[PDB]
Amino acid sequence: VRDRADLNKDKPVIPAAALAGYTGSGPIQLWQFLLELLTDKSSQSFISWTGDGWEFKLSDPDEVARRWGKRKNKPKMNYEKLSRGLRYYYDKNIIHKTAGKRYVYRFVSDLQSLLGYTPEELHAMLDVK
Amino acid sequence: VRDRADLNKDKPVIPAAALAGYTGSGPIQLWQFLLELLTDKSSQSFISWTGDGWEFKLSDPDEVARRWGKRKNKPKMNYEKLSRGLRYYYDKNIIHKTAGKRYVYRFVSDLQSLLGYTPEELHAMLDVK
DNA sequence: AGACAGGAAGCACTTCCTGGAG
DNA sequence: CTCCAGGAAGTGCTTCCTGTCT
């Protein structure tokens, strides 16, 4: 059995650069970035899936903001501003706020027809219940 | 003498990403993009310094646009549009258009005191004139 | 107080287009 | 024609602020 296919490795399952390159959507966007962090085993301490579908929660809001800023060269980035970005998604039907729960948002389920992966397949690949 | 791990190889003398990080100017901008290609030995075939100060020339506009498009994930990018972005630099005083010379522009923001380099030195680190 | 909704203004283009000069 | 100038509209935030709830 020479032809070995040991899947991927230890890198974000859905990296932002590739997603954005694939869709030719322009420079990387906030939701694409959060998607990368979420499909990456290591990032799991400051951002994770709540287990309920596409609902995710920013366990440590500032760590996520710090990286968002470091990624776009916006040193003064933080959650108060990062979140304004999310609120604009409410109309564009991309992400919605999970009312009543601190730091909790949910992608619209149509992300599944774009990614090709099911929230459950993604949960499995990583490790969440 | 092992401490001879001191190179000056084939990587841009001024990467756009690092320049942006150094200034914390946000996503890579077009003028930073062209700066990187101009300070990269391997790109002297489609874009290069004309030898007069910071005057540069797009010897192959389409290749520059293509590359520009690939950096920001905008596959439909062409010179027609890249040059529109350049024109918006006139009122911002970042670039001046050499009149009577196809595809020739000049950086006019004070690049020397921001990069620390000199038109001459950069000309030296490269083989231009 | 911090989380959160959304108005307002600004930034750096990207995309479309009229129009003028060589 | 192609280059080139610049108007006008739109995107995806970034930055700032009022106001509400909790």
PDB file of C-alpha atoms (C1' of nucleotides) in Angstrom:
ATOM      1  CA  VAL A   1       0.000   0.000   0.000  1.00  0.00           C
ATOM      2  CA  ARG A   2       2.324   2.741  -1.191  1.00  0.00           C
ATOM      3  CA  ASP A   3      -0.191   5.345  -2.288  1.00  0.00           C
ATOM      4  CA  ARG A   4      -0.660   6.870   1.151  1.00  0.00           C
ATOM      5  CA  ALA A   5      -3.257   9.562   1.700  1.00  0.00           C
ATOM      6  CA  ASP A   6      -2.872  10.749   5.279  1.00  0.00           C
ATOM      7  CA  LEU A   7      -5.528  13.441   4.853  1.00  0.00           C
ATOM      8  CA  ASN A   8      -4.385  17.010   5.529  1.00  0.00           C
ATOM      9  CA  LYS A   9      -2.154  17.763   8.541  1.00  0.00           C
ATOM     10  CA  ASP A  10      -2.346  20.403  11.298  1.00  0.00           C
ATOM     11  CA  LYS A  11      -3.645  23.482   9.487  1.00  0.00           C
ATOM     12  CA  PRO A  12      -7.008  25.285   9.439  1.00  0.00           C
ATOM     13  CA  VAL A  13      -9.457  23.007   7.622  1.00  0.00           C
ATOM     14  CA  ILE A  14     -10.911  26.031   5.849  1.00  0.00           C
ATOM     15  CA  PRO A  15      -8.162  28.629   5.529  1.00  0.00           C
ATOM     16  CA  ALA A  16      -9.339  32.165   4.693  1.00  0.00           C
ATOM     17  CA  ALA A  17      -6.880  32.878   1.906  1.00  0.00           C
ATOM     18  CA  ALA A  18      -7.956  29.771  -0.011  1.00  0.00           C
ATOM     19  CA  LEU A  19     -11.666  30.299   0.623  1.00  0.00           C
ATOM     20  CA  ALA A  20     -11.366  33.895  -0.559  1.00  0.00           C
ATOM     21  CA  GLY A  21      -9.189  32.862  -3.485  1.00  0.00           C
ATOM     22  CA  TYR A  22     -11.638  30.196  -4.500  1.00  0.00           C
ATOM     23  CA  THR A  23     -14.577  32.602  -4.460  1.00  0.00           C
ATOM     24  CA  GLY A  24     -12.638  35.553  -5.836  1.00  0.00           C
ATOM     25  CA  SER A  25     -14.410  37.661  -3.210  1.00  0.00           C
ATOM     26  CA  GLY A  26     -11.615  40.198  -2.850  1.00  0.00           C
ATOM     27  CA  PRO A  27      -9.490  40.812   0.253  1.00  0.00           C
ATOM     28  CA  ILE A  28     -10.215  38.520   3.208  1.00  0.00           C
ATOM     29  CA  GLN A  29     -13.419  39.347   5.172  1.00  0.00           C
ATOM     30  CA  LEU A  30     -14.381  39.129   8.854  1.00  0.00           C
ATOM     31  CA  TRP A  31     -16.576  36.072   8.530  1.00  0.00           C
ATOM     32  CA  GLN A  32     -13.969  34.247   6.439  1.00  0.00           C
ATOM     33  CA  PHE A  33     -11.377  34.943   9.117  1.00  0.00           C
ATOM     34  CA  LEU A  34     -13.583  33.702  11.979  1.00  0.00           C
ATOM     35  CA  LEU A  35     -14.254  30.637   9.877  1.00  0.00           C
ATOM     36  CA  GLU A  36     -10.537  29.902   9.651  1.00  0.00           C
ATOM     37  CA  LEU A  37      -9.972  30.297  13.379  1.00  0.00           C
ATOM     38  CA  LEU A  38     -12.882  27.957  14.007  1.00  0.00           C
ATOM     39  CA  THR A  39     -11.675  25.182  11.729  1.00  0.00           C
ATOM     40  CA  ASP A  40      -8.287  25.195  13.442  1.00  0.00           C
ATOM     41  CA  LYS A  41      -7.600  22.887  16.418  1.00  0.00           C
ATOM     42  CA  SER A  42      -5.206  25.261  18.185  1.00  0.00           C
ATOM     43  CA  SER A  43      -7.366  28.388  18.106  1.00  0.00           C
ATOM     44  CA  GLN A  44      -9.899  26.409  20.116  1.00  0.00           C
ATOM     45  CA  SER A  45      -9.150  28.195  23.389  1.00  0.00           C
ATOM     46  CA  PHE A  46     -10.347  31.688  22.391  1.00  0.00           C
ATOM     47  CA  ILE A  47     -13.020  30.744  19.830  1.00  0.00           C
ATOM     48  CA  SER A  48     -15.147  27.622  19.474  1.00  0.00           C
ATOM     49  CA  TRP A  49     -18.380  26.092  18.190  1.00  0.00           C
ATOM     50  CA  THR A  50     -21.144  25.811  20.810  1.00  0.00           C
ATOM     51  CA  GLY A  51     -22.109  22.492  19.236  1.00  0.00           C
ATOM     52  CA  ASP A  52     -25.499  23.750  18.066  1.00  0.00           C
ATOM     53  CA  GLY A  53     -25.271  23.914  14.275  1.00  0.00           C
ATOM     54  CA  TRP A  54     -23.341  26.908  12.974  1.00  0.00           C
ATOM     55  CA  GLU A  55     -23.504  28.775  16.271  1.00  0.00           C
ATOM     56  CA  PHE A  56     -20.115  29.909  17.498  1.00  0.00           C
ATOM     57  CA  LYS A  57     -18.930  31.827  20.533  1.00  0.00           C
ATOM     58  CA  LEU A  58     -15.988  34.137  21.116  1.00  0.00           C
ATOM     59  CA  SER A  59     -14.804  32.748  24.474  1.00  0.00           C
ATOM     60  CA  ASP A  60     -12.015  35.356  24.618  1.00  0.00           C
ATOM     61  CA  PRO A  61     -13.217  38.389  22.542  1.00  0.00           C
ATOM     62  CA  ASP A  62      -9.972  40.299  22.746  1.00  0.00           C
ATOM     63  CA  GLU A  63      -7.779  37.472  21.546  1.00  0.00           C
ATOM     64  CA  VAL A  64     -10.010  37.207  18.450  1.00  0.00           C
ATOM     65  CA  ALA A  65      -9.910  40.998  17.974  1.00  0.00           C
ATOM     66  CA  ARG A  66      -6.124  41.094  18.423  1.00  0.00           C
ATOM     67  CA  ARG A  67      -5.651  38.535  15.668  1.00  0.00           C
ATOM     68  CA  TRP A  68      -8.199  40.198  13.389  1.00  0.00           C
ATOM     69  CA  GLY A  69      -6.189  43.376  13.790  1.00  0.00           C
ATOM     70  CA  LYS A  70      -2.840  41.663  13.377  1.00  0.00           C
ATOM     71  CA  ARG A  71      -4.197  40.039  10.213  1.00  0.00           C
ATOM     72  CA  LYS A  72      -5.359  43.309   8.583  1.00  0.00           C
ATOM     73  CA  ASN A  73      -2.608  45.575   9.986  1.00  0.00           C
ATOM     74  CA  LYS A  74      -5.090  47.333  12.230  1.00  0.00           C
ATOM     75  CA  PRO A  75      -3.188  47.497  15.548  1.00  0.00           C
ATOM     76  CA  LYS A  76      -5.983  49.384  17.328  1.00  0.00           C
ATOM     77  CA  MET A  77      -8.593  46.710  16.503  1.00  0.00           C
ATOM     78  CA  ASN A  78     -10.770  45.385  19.336  1.00  0.00           C
ATOM     79  CA  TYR A  79     -14.145  43.785  20.015  1.00  0.00           C
ATOM     80  CA  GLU A  80     -16.227  46.995  20.160  1.00  0.00           C
ATOM     81  CA  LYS A  81     -15.241  47.704  16.559  1.00  0.00           C
ATOM     82  CA  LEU A  82     -14.908  44.129  15.353  1.00  0.00           C
ATOM     83  CA  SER A  83     -18.511  43.543  16.455  1.00  0.00           C
ATOM     84  CA  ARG A  84     -19.753  46.559  14.510  1.00  0.00           C
ATOM     85  CA  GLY A  85     -18.555  44.588  11.518  1.00  0.00           C
ATOM     86  CA  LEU A  86     -20.736  41.652  12.503  1.00  0.00           C
ATOM     87  CA  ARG A  87     -23.831  43.835  13.042  1.00  0.00           C
ATOM     88  CA  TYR A  88     -23.639  44.948   9.395  1.00  0.00           C
ATOM     89  CA  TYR A  89     -24.034  41.284   8.438  1.00  0.00           C
ATOM     90  CA  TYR A  90     -27.533  41.197   9.910  1.00  0.00           C
ATOM     91  CA  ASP A  91     -29.003  42.537   6.662  1.00  0.00           C
ATOM     92  CA  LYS A  92     -26.637  40.805   4.276  1.00  0.00           C
ATOM     93  CA  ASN A  93     -27.811  37.505   5.754  1.00  0.00           C
ATOM     94  CA  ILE A  94     -24.403  36.001   6.574  1.00  0.00           C
ATOM     95  CA  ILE A  95     -24.278  35.913  10.375  1.00  0.00           C
ATOM     96  CA  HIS A  96     -26.979  36.551  12.963  1.00  0.00           C
ATOM     97  CA  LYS A  97     -26.753  37.301  16.687  1.00  0.00           C
ATOM     98  CA  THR A  98     -27.771  34.630  19.194  1.00  0.00           C
ATOM     99  CA  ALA A  99     -29.906  36.915  21.382  1.00  0.00           C
ATOM    100  CA  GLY A 100     -29.392  36.668  25.124  1.00  0.00           C
ATOM    101  CA  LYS A 101     -25.973  35.041  24.939  1.00  0.00           C
ATOM    102  CA  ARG A 102     -22.737  36.958  25.384  1.00  0.00           C
ATOM    103  CA  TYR A 103     -20.356  36.757  22.422  1.00  0.00           C
ATOM    104  CA  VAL A 104     -22.512  34.342  20.438  1.00  0.00           C
ATOM    105  CA  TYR A 105     -23.243  34.392  16.716  1.00  0.00           C
ATOM    106  CA  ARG A 106     -24.405  31.947  14.045  1.00  0.00           C
ATOM    107  CA  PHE A 107     -23.556  31.744  10.324  1.00  0.00           C
ATOM    108  CA  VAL A 108     -26.597  31.400   8.037  1.00  0.00           C
ATOM    109  CA  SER A 109     -26.961  27.719   7.154  1.00  0.00           C
ATOM    110  CA  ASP A 110     -26.317  28.411   3.486  1.00  0.00           C
ATOM    111  CA  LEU A 111     -22.602  28.360   4.278  1.00  0.00           C
ATOM    112  CA  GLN A 112     -22.995  24.608   3.805  1.00  0.00           C
ATOM    113  CA  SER A 113     -23.652  24.901   0.083  1.00  0.00           C
ATOM    114  CA  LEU A 114     -20.580  27.094  -0.303  1.00  0.00           C
ATOM    115  CA  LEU A 115     -18.155  25.139   1.898  1.00  0.00           C
ATOM    116  CA  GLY A 116     -19.273  21.630   1.033  1.00  0.00           C
ATOM    117  CA  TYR A 117     -18.964  20.623   4.676  1.00  0.00           C
ATOM    118  CA  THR A 118     -21.766  20.066   7.156  1.00  0.00           C
ATOM    119  CA  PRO A 119     -21.599  21.694  10.583  1.00  0.00           C
ATOM    120  CA  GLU A 120     -21.591  18.152  11.977  1.00  0.00           C
ATOM    121  CA  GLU A 121     -18.808  16.975   9.640  1.00  0.00           C
ATOM    122  CA  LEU A 122     -16.762  19.958  10.774  1.00  0.00           C
ATOM    123  CA  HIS A 123     -17.528  19.312  14.452  1.00  0.00           C
ATOM    124  CA  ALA A 124     -16.373  15.718  13.955  1.00  0.00           C
ATOM    125  CA  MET A 125     -13.151  16.588  12.114  1.00  0.00           C
ATOM    126  CA  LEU A 126     -12.244  18.753  15.093  1.00  0.00           C
ATOM    127  CA  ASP A 127     -13.593  17.680  18.509  1.00  0.00           C
ATOM    128  CA  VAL A 128     -16.747  19.206  19.985  1.00  0.00           C
ATOM    129  CA  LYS A 129     -20.042  18.064  21.485  1.00  0.00           C
TER     130      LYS A 129
ATOM    131  CA  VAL B   1      32.332  32.232  11.046  1.00  0.00           C
ATOM    132  CA  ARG B   2      29.312  29.953  11.120  1.00  0.00           C
ATOM    133  CA  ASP B   3      27.657  33.182  12.172  1.00  0.00           C
ATOM    134  CA  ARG B   4      27.756  33.687   8.393  1.00  0.00           C
ATOM    135  CA  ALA B   5      24.029  33.069   8.411  1.00  0.00           C
ATOM    136  CA  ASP B   6      23.805  36.566   6.877  1.00  0.00           C
ATOM    137  CA  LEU B   7      21.988  36.698   3.541  1.00  0.00           C
ATOM    138  CA  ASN B   8      20.510  39.312   1.195  1.00  0.00           C
ATOM    139  CA  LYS B   9      18.870  36.793  -1.176  1.00  0.00           C
ATOM    140  CA  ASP B  10      15.955  36.915  -3.629  1.00  0.00           C
ATOM    141  CA  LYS B  11      13.087  38.392  -1.625  1.00  0.00           C
ATOM    142  CA  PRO B  12      11.712  41.910  -2.082  1.00  0.00           C
ATOM    143  CA  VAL B  13      13.867  44.588  -0.418  1.00  0.00           C
ATOM    144  CA  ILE B  14      10.582  46.132   0.703  1.00  0.00           C
ATOM    145  CA  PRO B  15       7.701  43.667   1.137  1.00  0.00           C
ATOM    146  CA  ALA B  16       4.272  45.296   1.051  1.00  0.00           C
ATOM    147  CA  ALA B  17       3.020  43.261   4.028  1.00  0.00           C
ATOM    148  CA  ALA B  18       5.908  44.307   6.308  1.00  0.00           C
ATOM    149  CA  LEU B  19       5.736  47.934   5.185  1.00  0.00           C
ATOM    150  CA  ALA B  20       2.062  47.953   6.122  1.00  0.00           C
ATOM    151  CA  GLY B  21       2.796  46.279   9.451  1.00  0.00           C
ATOM    152  CA  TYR B  22       5.530  48.809  10.166  1.00  0.00           C
ATOM    153  CA  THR B  23       3.120  51.645   9.530  1.00  0.00           C
ATOM    154  CA  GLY B  24      -0.012  49.824  10.599  1.00  0.00           C
ATOM    155  CA  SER B  25      -1.733  51.209   7.517  1.00  0.00           C
ATOM    156  CA  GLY B  26      -4.324  48.441   7.189  1.00  0.00           C
ATOM    157  CA  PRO B  27      -4.694  46.060   4.211  1.00  0.00           C
ATOM    158  CA  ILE B  28      -1.931  46.249   1.602  1.00  0.00           C
ATOM    159  CA  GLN B  29      -2.551  49.291  -0.637  1.00  0.00           C
ATOM    160  CA  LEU B  30      -1.764  49.568  -4.343  1.00  0.00           C
ATOM    161  CA  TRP B  31       1.249  51.869  -4.000  1.00  0.00           C
ATOM    162  CA  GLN B  32       2.794  49.529  -1.444  1.00  0.00           C
ATOM    163  CA  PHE B  33       2.141  46.688  -3.838  1.00  0.00           C
ATOM    164  CA  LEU B  34       4.050  48.319  -6.689  1.00  0.00           C
ATOM    165  CA  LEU B  35       6.856  49.202  -4.293  1.00  0.00           C
ATOM    166  CA  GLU B  36       7.406  45.530  -3.495  1.00  0.00           C
ATOM    167  CA  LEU B  37       7.570  44.472  -7.162  1.00  0.00           C
ATOM    168  CA  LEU B  38      10.031  47.317  -7.862  1.00  0.00           C
ATOM    169  CA  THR B  39      12.374  46.102  -5.131  1.00  0.00           C
ATOM    170  CA  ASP B  40      12.413  42.498  -6.381  1.00  0.00           C
ATOM    171  CA  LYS B  41      15.113  41.410  -8.845  1.00  0.00           C
ATOM    172  CA  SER B  42      12.877  38.790 -10.475  1.00  0.00           C
ATOM    173  CA  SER B  43      10.186  41.328 -11.460  1.00  0.00           C
ATOM    174  CA  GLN B  44      12.350  43.694 -13.500  1.00  0.00           C
ATOM    175  CA  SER B  45      10.744  42.389 -16.671  1.00  0.00           C
ATOM    176  CA  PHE B  46       7.282  43.931 -16.304  1.00  0.00           C
ATOM    177  CA  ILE B  47       7.902  46.847 -13.928  1.00  0.00           C
ATOM    178  CA  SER B  48      11.063  48.813 -13.087  1.00  0.00           C
ATOM    179  CA  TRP B  49      12.663  52.130 -12.088  1.00  0.00           C
ATOM    180  CA  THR B  50      13.400  54.483 -14.964  1.00  0.00           C
ATOM    181  CA  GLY B  51      16.490  55.795 -13.195  1.00  0.00           C
ATOM    182  CA  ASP B  52      15.108  59.264 -12.429  1.00  0.00           C
ATOM    183  CA  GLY B  53      14.363  59.556  -8.711  1.00  0.00           C
ATOM    184  CA  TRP B  54      11.286  57.504  -7.829  1.00  0.00           C
ATOM    185  CA  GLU B  55       9.903  57.432 -11.357  1.00  0.00           C
ATOM    186  CA  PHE B  56       8.753  53.959 -12.305  1.00  0.00           C
ATOM    187  CA  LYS B  57       7.372  52.423 -15.447  1.00  0.00           C
ATOM    188  CA  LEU B  58       4.879  49.667 -16.104  1.00  0.00           C
ATOM    189  CA  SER B  59       6.581  48.014 -19.095  1.00  0.00           C
ATOM    190  CA  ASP B  60       3.849  45.368 -18.973  1.00  0.00           C
ATOM    191  CA  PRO B  61       0.679  46.902 -17.419  1.00  0.00           C
ATOM    192  CA  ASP B  62      -1.350  43.726 -17.889  1.00  0.00           C
ATOM    193  CA  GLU B  63       1.131  41.577 -15.929  1.00  0.00           C
ATOM    194  CA  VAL B  64       1.123  44.118 -13.093  1.00  0.00           C
ATOM    195  CA  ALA B  65      -2.676  44.183 -13.054  1.00  0.00           C
ATOM    196  CA  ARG B  66      -2.866  40.393 -13.214  1.00  0.00           C
ATOM    197  CA  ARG B  67      -0.540  40.118 -10.224  1.00  0.00           C
ATOM    198  CA  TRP B  68      -2.402  42.923  -8.417  1.00  0.00           C
ATOM    199  CA  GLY B  69      -5.581  40.994  -9.012  1.00  0.00           C
ATOM    200  CA  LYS B  70      -4.098  37.801  -7.589  1.00  0.00           C
ATOM    201  CA  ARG B  71      -2.899  39.543  -4.418  1.00  0.00           C
ATOM    202  CA  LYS B  72      -6.336  40.869  -3.491  1.00  0.00           C
ATOM    203  CA  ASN B  73      -8.382  38.036  -5.040  1.00  0.00           C
ATOM    204  CA  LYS B  74     -10.001  40.076  -7.808  1.00  0.00           C
ATOM    205  CA  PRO B  75      -9.610  37.882 -10.923  1.00  0.00           C
ATOM    206  CA  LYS B  76     -11.321  40.428 -13.209  1.00  0.00           C
ATOM    207  CA  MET B  77      -8.668  43.090 -12.485  1.00  0.00           C
ATOM    208  CA  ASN B  78      -7.055  44.869 -15.441  1.00  0.00           C
ATOM    209  CA  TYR B  79      -4.911  47.967 -15.970  1.00  0.00           C
ATOM    210  CA  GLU B  80      -7.988  49.980 -16.995  1.00  0.00           C
ATOM    211  CA  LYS B  81      -9.143  49.681 -13.368  1.00  0.00           C
ATOM    212  CA  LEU B  82      -5.796  49.535 -11.544  1.00  0.00           C
ATOM    213  CA  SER B  83      -4.957  52.891 -13.115  1.00  0.00           C
ATOM    214  CA  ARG B  84      -8.219  54.355 -11.827  1.00  0.00           C
ATOM    215  CA  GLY B  85      -6.979  53.631  -8.328  1.00  0.00           C
ATOM    216  CA  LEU B  86      -3.743  55.359  -9.212  1.00  0.00           C
ATOM    217  CA  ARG B  87      -5.603  58.466 -10.384  1.00  0.00           C
ATOM    218  CA  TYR B  88      -7.190  58.805  -6.955  1.00  0.00           C
ATOM    219  CA  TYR B  89      -3.634  59.256  -5.691  1.00  0.00           C
ATOM    220  CA  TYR B  90      -3.300  62.596  -7.450  1.00  0.00           C
ATOM    221  CA  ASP B  91      -5.391  64.530  -4.903  1.00  0.00           C
ATOM    222  CA  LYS B  92      -3.821  62.520  -2.114  1.00  0.00           C
ATOM    223  CA  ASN B  93      -0.344  63.532  -3.327  1.00  0.00           C
ATOM    224  CA  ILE B  94       1.059  60.020  -3.376  1.00  0.00           C
ATOM    225  CA  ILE B  95       1.637  59.808  -7.091  1.00  0.00           C
ATOM    226  CA  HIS B  96       2.314  62.114 -10.006  1.00  0.00           C
ATOM    227  CA  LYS B  97       1.781  61.226 -13.667  1.00  0.00           C
ATOM    228  CA  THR B  98       4.676  61.924 -15.956  1.00  0.00           C
ATOM    229  CA  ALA B  99       3.056  63.659 -18.910  1.00  0.00           C
ATOM    230  CA  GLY B 100       3.821  62.279 -22.354  1.00  0.00           C
ATOM    231  CA  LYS B 101       5.115  58.922 -21.187  1.00  0.00           C
ATOM    232  CA  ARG B 102       2.918  55.859 -21.437  1.00  0.00           C
ATOM    233  CA  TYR B 103       2.643  53.918 -18.175  1.00  0.00           C
ATOM    234  CA  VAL B 104       5.082  56.146 -16.296  1.00  0.00           C
ATOM    235  CA  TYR B 105       4.275  57.327 -12.774  1.00  0.00           C
ATOM    236  CA  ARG B 106       6.257  58.764  -9.855  1.00  0.00           C
ATOM    237  CA  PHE B 107       5.953  58.339  -6.074  1.00  0.00           C
ATOM    238  CA  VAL B 108       5.755  61.802  -4.546  1.00  0.00           C
ATOM    239  CA  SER B 109       5.025  61.141  -0.883  1.00  0.00           C
ATOM    240  CA  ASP B 110       8.398  61.432   0.839  1.00  0.00           C
ATOM    241  CA  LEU B 111       9.402  57.777   0.442  1.00  0.00           C
ATOM    242  CA  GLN B 112      13.061  58.326   1.336  1.00  0.00           C
ATOM    243  CA  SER B 113      12.347  59.335   4.941  1.00  0.00           C
ATOM    244  CA  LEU B 114       9.776  56.557   5.372  1.00  0.00           C
ATOM    245  CA  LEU B 115      11.824  53.694   3.975  1.00  0.00           C
ATOM    246  CA  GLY B 116      15.221  54.959   5.052  1.00  0.00           C
ATOM    247  CA  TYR B 117      16.537  53.995   1.626  1.00  0.00           C
ATOM    248  CA  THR B 118      17.573  56.232  -1.243  1.00  0.00           C
ATOM    249  CA  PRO B 119      16.571  56.169  -4.901  1.00  0.00           C
ATOM    250  CA  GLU B 120      20.280  55.599  -5.509  1.00  0.00           C
ATOM    251  CA  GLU B 121      20.820  52.799  -2.940  1.00  0.00           C
ATOM    252  CA  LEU B 122      17.761  50.905  -4.131  1.00  0.00           C
ATOM    253  CA  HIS B 123      19.132  51.430  -7.640  1.00  0.00           C
ATOM    254  CA  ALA B 124      22.359  49.905  -6.306  1.00  0.00           C
ATOM    255  CA  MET B 125      20.839  46.926  -4.473  1.00  0.00           C
ATOM    256  CA  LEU B 126      19.373  46.318  -7.914  1.00  0.00           C
ATOM    257  CA  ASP B 127      20.965  46.863 -11.330  1.00  0.00           C
ATOM    258  CA  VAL B 128      19.120  49.885 -12.671  1.00  0.00           C
ATOM    259  CA  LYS B 129      19.713  53.242 -14.393  1.00  0.00           C
TER     260      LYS B 129
ATOM    261  C1'  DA C   1     -20.187  49.431  33.479  1.00  0.00           C
ATOM    262  C1'  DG C   2     -20.171  46.215  29.155  1.00  0.00           C
ATOM    263  C1'  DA C   3     -23.004  44.102  25.618  1.00  0.00           C
ATOM    264  C1'  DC C   4     -25.553  45.356  21.814  1.00  0.00           C
ATOM    265  C1'  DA C   5     -28.451  47.870  17.836  1.00  0.00           C
ATOM    266  C1'  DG C   6     -27.765  50.865  14.285  1.00  0.00           C
ATOM    267  C1'  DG C   7     -26.915  56.060  12.391  1.00  0.00           C
ATOM    268  C1'  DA C   8     -23.289  58.807  10.259  1.00  0.00           C
ATOM    269  C1'  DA C   9     -19.056  59.744   8.080  1.00  0.00           C
ATOM    270  C1'  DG C  10     -14.649  58.317   6.017  1.00  0.00           C
ATOM    271  C1'  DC C  11     -11.193  55.173   3.532  1.00  0.00           C
ATOM    272  C1'  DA C  12      -9.174  52.662  -0.555  1.00  0.00           C
ATOM    273  C1'  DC C  13     -10.365  50.964  -3.813  1.00  0.00           C
ATOM    274  C1'  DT C  14     -13.439  48.255  -7.714  1.00  0.00           C
ATOM    275  C1'  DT C  15     -16.553  48.638 -11.349  1.00  0.00           C
ATOM    276  C1'  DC C  16     -18.889  51.480 -15.010  1.00  0.00           C
ATOM    277  C1'  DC C  17     -18.809  55.383 -17.869  1.00  0.00           C
ATOM    278  C1'  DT C  18     -18.626  60.069 -20.424  1.00  0.00           C
ATOM    279  C1'  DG C  19     -15.404  62.665 -22.664  1.00  0.00           C
ATOM    280  C1'  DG C  20     -11.036  64.686 -24.447  1.00  0.00           C
ATOM    281  C1'  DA C  21      -6.151  64.324 -26.690  1.00  0.00           C
ATOM    282  C1'  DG C  22      -2.897  62.137 -29.582  1.00  0.00           C
TER     283       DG C  22
ATOM    284  C1'  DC D   1      -8.265  52.805 -31.062  1.00  0.00           C
ATOM    285  C1'  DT D   2      -5.622  53.369 -26.348  1.00  0.00           C
ATOM    286  C1'  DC D   3      -4.170  56.322 -22.941  1.00  0.00           C
ATOM    287  C1'  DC D   4      -5.735  59.276 -19.673  1.00  0.00           C
ATOM    288  C1'  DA D   5      -8.794  62.404 -16.356  1.00  0.00           C
ATOM    289  C1'  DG D   6     -12.335  62.298 -13.211  1.00  0.00           C
ATOM    290  C1'  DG D   7     -17.668  61.786 -12.035  1.00  0.00           C
ATOM    291  C1'  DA D   8     -20.719  58.760  -9.617  1.00  0.00           C
ATOM    292  C1'  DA D   9     -22.144  54.607  -7.148  1.00  0.00           C
ATOM    293  C1'  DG D  10     -21.194  50.659  -4.240  1.00  0.00           C
ATOM    294  C1'  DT D  11     -18.542  47.363  -1.080  1.00  0.00           C
ATOM    295  C1'  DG D  12     -16.717  46.042   3.556  1.00  0.00           C
ATOM    296  C1'  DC D  13     -15.290  47.451   6.884  1.00  0.00           C
ATOM    297  C1'  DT D  14     -12.959  51.065  10.672  1.00  0.00           C
ATOM    298  C1'  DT D  15     -13.788  54.611  13.874  1.00  0.00           C
ATOM    299  C1'  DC D  16     -17.002  57.310  16.649  1.00  0.00           C
ATOM    300  C1'  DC D  17     -21.342  58.073  18.921  1.00  0.00           C
ATOM    301  C1'  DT D  18     -26.302  58.031  20.821  1.00  0.00           C
ATOM    302  C1'  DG D  19     -29.339  55.227  23.297  1.00  0.00           C
ATOM    303  C1'  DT D  20     -31.233  50.921  25.364  1.00  0.00           C
ATOM    304  C1'  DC D  21     -30.880  46.597  28.376  1.00  0.00           C
ATOM    305  C1'  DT D  22     -29.055  44.293  32.047  1.00  0.00           C
TER     306       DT D  22
END
